[PDB]
Amino acid sequence: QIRYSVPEETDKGTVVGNISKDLGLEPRELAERGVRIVSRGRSQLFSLNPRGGSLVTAGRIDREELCAQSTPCLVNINILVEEKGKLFGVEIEITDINDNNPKFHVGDLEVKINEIAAPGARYPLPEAVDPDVGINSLQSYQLSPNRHFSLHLQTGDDGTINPELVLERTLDREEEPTHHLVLTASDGGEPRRSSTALIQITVLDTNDNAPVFDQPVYRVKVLENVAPGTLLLTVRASDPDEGVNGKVTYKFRKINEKQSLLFHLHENTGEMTVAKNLDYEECSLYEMEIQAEDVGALLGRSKVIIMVEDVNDNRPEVTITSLFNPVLENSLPGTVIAFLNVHDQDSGKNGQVVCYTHDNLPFKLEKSIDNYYRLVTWKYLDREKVSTYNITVIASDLGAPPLSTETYIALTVADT
Ligand SMILES: *[C@@H]1O[C@H](CO[C@@H]2O[C@@H](C)[C@@H](O)[C@@H](O)[C@@H]2O)[C@@H](O[C@@H]2O[C@H](CO)[C@@H](O[C@@H]3O[C@H](CO)[C@@H](O)[C@H](O)[C@@H]3O)[C@H](O)[C@H]2NC(C)=O)[C@H](O)[C@H]1NC(C)=O
Ligand SMILES: *[C@@H]1O[C@H](CO)[C@@H](O[C@@H]2O[C@H](CO)[C@@H](O)[C@H](O)[C@H]2NC(C)=O)[C@H](O)[C@H]1NC(C)=O
Ligand SMILES: *[C@H]1O[C@H](CO)[C@@H](O)[C@H](O)[C@@H]1O
Ligand SMILES: *[C@H]1O[C@H](CO)[C@@H](O)[C@H](O)[C@@H]1O
Ligand SMILES: [Ca+2]
Ligand SMILES: [Ca+2]
Ligand SMILES: [Ca+2]
Ligand SMILES: [Ca+2]
Ligand SMILES: [Ca+2]
Ligand SMILES: [Ca+2]
Ligand SMILES: [Ca+2]
Ligand SMILES: [Ca+2]
Ligand SMILES: [Ca+2]
Structure with a gap:
């Protein structure tokens, strides 16, 4: 009492x-x-x-x-x-x-939320306890700020409170794979005590990103005389998906295309190299389509364009299409004695031909229609001073290193 x-x-x-x-x-x-x-x-x-x-x-x-x-x-x-x-x-x-501060039982917690997790899902959080009772027990739950998460104080009938983390904004680990939050718990008495709890959020990966090539079209020029195995190109494709979801393999799209037989695209490194010799004179352009995949068979598609260059390798060929061999000694200057056809399978200046003959001879070579030539006479001839002629005609293309084909025209001068 x-x-x-x-x-x-x-x-x-x-x-x-x-x-x-x-x-x-x-x-x-x-x-x-x-x-x-x-x-x-x-x-x-x-x-x-x-x-x-x-x-x-x-x-x-x-x-x-x-x-x-x-x-x-x-x-x-x-x-x-x-x-x-x-x-x-x-x-x-x-x-x-x-x-007595609010003591968390666990100092840290990892919450594994998937990348494709829909908003609204809530996960339990570590609870706190305060041996101080009344107003000196826990009174305020303060969660660290974050754009993707909120704090809900769900109360089961038995439990006085149950804190839980709510996912309010979608996630993508390709921008941030892990988050770190500070869960502060404070009791509402003076002096105000508190204790925190670190919460790491691990965003598990989802194969939601497909391989994407750096450039949609790859153009590369190459000489026709490159040795097989020469590195023509090296293609890159990026996949931000994690680990095995990012390991990318490159391959040709077509099924045993002839161009695919002529070239080799390495599966792992994506290096495009030559396999067999290729001549400019058959095909000057090669349009191929390549693709890159991760393990999820997500397809990235690109196009490689290969242009050939005509380095000189084909010499001209002279075809004596006409030859008026019994030449009249009294023929006026300007009479034709032989028509020649010249043809260099090379292109450009490598296919442009020029013809040459000795200076001392009274016969000159003149250009004509459709890369033809005519062997014209411009000076009179003494019949006995020159009875037989073995003319050396040299056709040469204008592409260095120049190639030359020589053809010899046998003719004889007759009078009347
Ligand atoms: C007009 O002249 C050409 C060649 O030009 C001249 O003769 C050469 C020997 C050189 O001195 C050149 O600098 C010169 O301007 C005559 O062409 C020649 O034809 C003969 C046979 O038709 C070739 O002989 C060859 O011999 C070898 C080895 O024996 C054989 O394996 C061959 O099968 C072939 O028989 C000779 O090599 C060839 N000259 C060249 C440079 O290739 C051409 O006959 C002549 N025209 C006339 C009408 O006489
Ligand atoms: C318990 O209470 C009594 C009464 O309130 C206290 O007696 C007082 O003691 C002070 C000491 O300076 C005096 O000035 C007062 O005149 C006293 N009052 C009365 C009514 O006696 C006493 O000191 C307190 N403590 C103990 C141990 O008895
Ligand atoms: C928890 O929060 C209180 C404020 O309410 C701090 O004073 C304390 O040191 C702890 O950080
Ligand atoms: C909250 O944060 C503090 C650091 O400021 C930690 O020391 C504490 O244990 C809790 O994790
Ligand atoms: Ca105490
Ligand atoms: Ca307390
Ligand atoms: Ca106390
Ligand atoms: Ca993503
Ligand atoms: Ca992903
Ligand atoms: Ca991927
Ligand atoms: Ca060629
Ligand atoms: Ca060529
Ligand atoms: Ca040529």
Whole structure:
């Protein structure tokens, strides 16, 4: 029936209550009558101060350990006055003080959310506990800011609270594979204590990105006399998908195209090289289509264009299409004696032909229609001074290194 109050975690020997006044006696009388305390468990932590004539604490008083989460912390002791033969009941309340932070059971948690996870899905979060009760228990859950997540305080009927992370915006690990959040838990008493909990969010990969070539069309020029195996090109295709979902193989699209037989595209490195010799005079252009795939068979498509260059390799060929061999000695300057056809299978300046004959001879070569030539006469001839002629005609293309074919025209001069 003697109520008192005391703060916990207080020093030893702190005043609990003026017992001698509420007993109607002096301190020396308390030390004289032999008034003691009845031997019970909790009463071990209290003691009687005669000089102070009061009630002092003789041990550590932790409410969090003593009464746990009960709403009032009460300790009842019985005081026995022997000479008066009377007994008194003392009820002592212990107040709560915020010396315990909200302690998370787990310091960190990994939440594996898929890349293709739809918004609205919620995942459980680590809970906190505060041995401090009342307003000194947990009161505020503060989640670190993030554009993709929110904090929901779902309350099961039994559980007082249950924090959970809510996915409100879609994710893509191709931009960020892992997130890091700070889950602060604070109790609403002064001084304000708190404790955090780091939450890593691992975004698992989904093969949602297909291989994409750097350029849609690849153009490359090449000489026709390149040795087989020469590195013509090296194609690159990017796949941001993780690991095995990013390993890309390149291959030709067509099924055993002749161009695919002529060339080799390496599967792993994508290096396009020559396999067999290729002549400009057969095909000057090669249009092929290549593709790149990850393991998910996601298709990227591109087109490689190969242009050949006509380096000189074919010499001209002279075809004497006409020859008026019995030449008249009295022929006027300007009469034709032989028509020639010249043809260089090469192209450009490598296919342009020029013809040459000796200077001392009275016969010149003149150009004509459709790369023809005519062997014209411009000076009169002494029949005996020149009876037989073995003319050397040299056809040569204008592409270095020049190629030359020589044809010999046999003729004889006759008179009348
Ligand atoms: C007009 O002249 C050409 C060649 O031009 C002249 O003769 C050469 C020998 C050189 O001195 C040149 O600088 C010169 O301007 C005559 O062509 C020649 O034809 C003969 C046979 O028709 C070739 O003989 C060859 O001999 C070898 C080895 O014996 C054989 O394997 C061959 O099968 C072939 O028989 C000779 O090589 C060839 N000249 C050249 C340079 O190739 C051409 O006959 C002549 N015209 C007339 C009407 O006489
Ligand atoms: C318990 O309470 C009594 C009464 O309130 C206290 O007695 C007072 O002591 C002070 C000491 O300076 C005096 O000035 C007052 O005149 C006293 N009042 C009365 C009514 O006696 C006493 O000191 C307190 N403590 C103990 C151990 O008895
Ligand atoms: C948790 O938050 C409180 C503020 O409410 C801080 O004072 C404390 O140090 C902890 O960071
Ligand atoms: C929240 O963050 C702090 C660092 O500021 C940690 O020390 C704590 O354990 C919790 O993870
Ligand atoms: Ca305490
Ligand atoms: Ca406390
Ligand atoms: Ca607390
Ligand atoms: Ca993606
Ligand atoms: Ca992905
Ligand atoms: Ca991929
Ligand atoms: Ca050629
Ligand atoms: Ca050529
Ligand atoms: Ca040529």
